[PDB]
Amino acid sequence: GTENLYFQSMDTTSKLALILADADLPAALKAIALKVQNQERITFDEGVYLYENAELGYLGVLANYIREQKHGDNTYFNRNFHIEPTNVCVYDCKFCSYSRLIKQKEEGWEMSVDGMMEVLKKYDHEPVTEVHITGGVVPKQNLEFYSDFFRRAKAHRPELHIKALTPVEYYYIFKKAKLSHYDGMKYMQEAGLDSMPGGGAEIFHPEVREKIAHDKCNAEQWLDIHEQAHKLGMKTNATMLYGHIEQFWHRVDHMERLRRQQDKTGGFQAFIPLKFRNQHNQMDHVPEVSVIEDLRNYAIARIYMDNFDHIKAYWAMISRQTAQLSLNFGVDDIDGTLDDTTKIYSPAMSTRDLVDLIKQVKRKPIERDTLYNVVTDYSQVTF
Template sequence: MSVRMPSQAVWGTRRNSSVMAPERTHMETIASKVRAGIALSRADGVYLYKEAPFHALGRLAHEVRTAKNGKKAYYVVKRYLNTTNVCYADCKFCSFAAYEKDPRAYRMPLEEILDKACAQPDDYDELHIVGGHDPKQTSLDFWIPAIAEMKRRIPHVQLALFTAAEIDYMCKRARCSYQDGLERLRDAGLTSLNGGGAEILVKRVRDLICPRKANVEEWLEVHRVAHRVGIKTNCTMLYGHVETIEERVQHLLLLRDLQANTGGFKCFVPLAFHPEGNALEECGWTGGIDDLRTIAVSRLMLDNIDHIKAYWISYGIKVAQLGLHFGADDIDGTVNNEQHIYRDAGSTTDQSTPIAELKRAISEAGFEPTRRNLLYRVLEPA
């Protein structure tokens, strides 16, 4: 005798009468909105974070990810440099920065930067540079000729340079507008801005963790102007420290609103806070569940951003693989051993992974490894 299973619609649904339509759960309502292309609300975001069944959340995020990007999982072959860790901004979550006289402080001279940025083999597609707010290096006068020289030596490489916080710092020091500074950088050869410096875009949080760098409005304005002058950018969220769930959702809504106006964000990158060697040590490490839930909620809330990155340097390659099933379509890429920011914060993840290993990790997760450039053009051969 066969056993009749209840239909899927009955699971988790409370019926009070055989003639009444079943009450929809909040998750079902959200799924309907997502499938109808309706942007989710603040309340939806908080629900997804705090109450949504974990697997149902992951399934829905995966559905969206598949609709946007099919089976593709992107990676990029890049070179990464942190050219100076000298910084006086004193962000409480930062394990990387050092005052000038600190024995940990370093500042690469221009020739070292150019040698590392342009070293052979130059078979990479992206050069990624971020650094501290260094009074002696982080300036338009230093970087504009440096960028022009990089473009001369490695014209095929796209340049992902600086965060909005660094742009704010450089433009204020040069006493110029964001538009003027960004146009000069663009004309020198800058392709894209990196997404860092966003942390949590809420004044209460920034007052606690990073009161001395670009504020909410300034961070958003740099990206708004960058998009206006033709520079695409990424955006991030540093989560897992002093913020509330409601503040994470507020952050996502601000990014979505800006994207609705400009369309200039390529990718959103949730960054897990790492606690070692900084003033927020007591916040501890994020858990894998929070990491995956954050990826999935991001995928659902940021319906107008095409790509969500499971940044393997932040979570490790194993969680990044799972992230591909929770809404992410990108795991970042190969980097050389010059990534200091997560290493200084206690990351034990190997900071360099060969292409073959990334492709294996993507394939093992059931996706198609797809080599891309900075602007998500697919490159061949994969």
């Protein structure tokens, strides 16, 4: 007929009404669709039910309804850069190339505070607004190391926002320094820490965590360090590593613990699915999941995580097509390090490239501030 074409042509609100009026839709899926229409929270069991039963089309109707209700077409990005203090690590995560079981200390490097400051100064005449600091955990890079770096960075470039380190790092540094998590985070904030990134969550459930990330900080510890950051007024993000050896209920359990923490302390801005990759780690024969599973996962994340403003995708972590399609399955925040530089003396994402990627799937490219206000609306900007 033209039935599929007509459904595809409907506005977001009409699509959800059409699903709710479909006599053939199983009752479980109608009840969940009705919750979404009413901005009601879905349960753990409903989350599992979506992962086990829901088709991509259905999930896109719900997730996109939420994404447009919260953000309209806005698709946010900012101008950041990275410093990696070390590319080796004391811990043994089976999905990570820096695991002490696959990479000896001699096969990598550990920056000094001087070296980190030399990297930071390369960006002095760049319109970056924040630096992201993440990497391995090593004994020389302790409380004094990081606090000295934050103080030197703020002395040199006061206006540069520092988004640095995960609870995996903070648990290790605060245990050795004999500070409580609160007093440790307070000390780092005073030194110049502004916010935290979302890494190190992996999967919370011990059934999975004991297998893939057995020796670094546990879920209670990870959530506790975010709780203390939130009590100090800091913003943070949260991740979930998916599509490896976990079961769908392990994903919903993960998201449930995050959702309860957000209801307690309110400090998370973005939820960030991280797709497992089977290259250069101890999990080389674990198959990666399909683009369809990536998109069902973004959608279910959008539906489940009702108290997180943003769902973030990293353009360098997924294909161009997956990143663009994700903007229709719940994603409103697209991230990575923008690179307008030209190689001299001879795959970067320029601002023009990213703006065109976003406009190609009918979305509105927004350069944001740290609280997701509009700094530049690129929608009618021509280059």
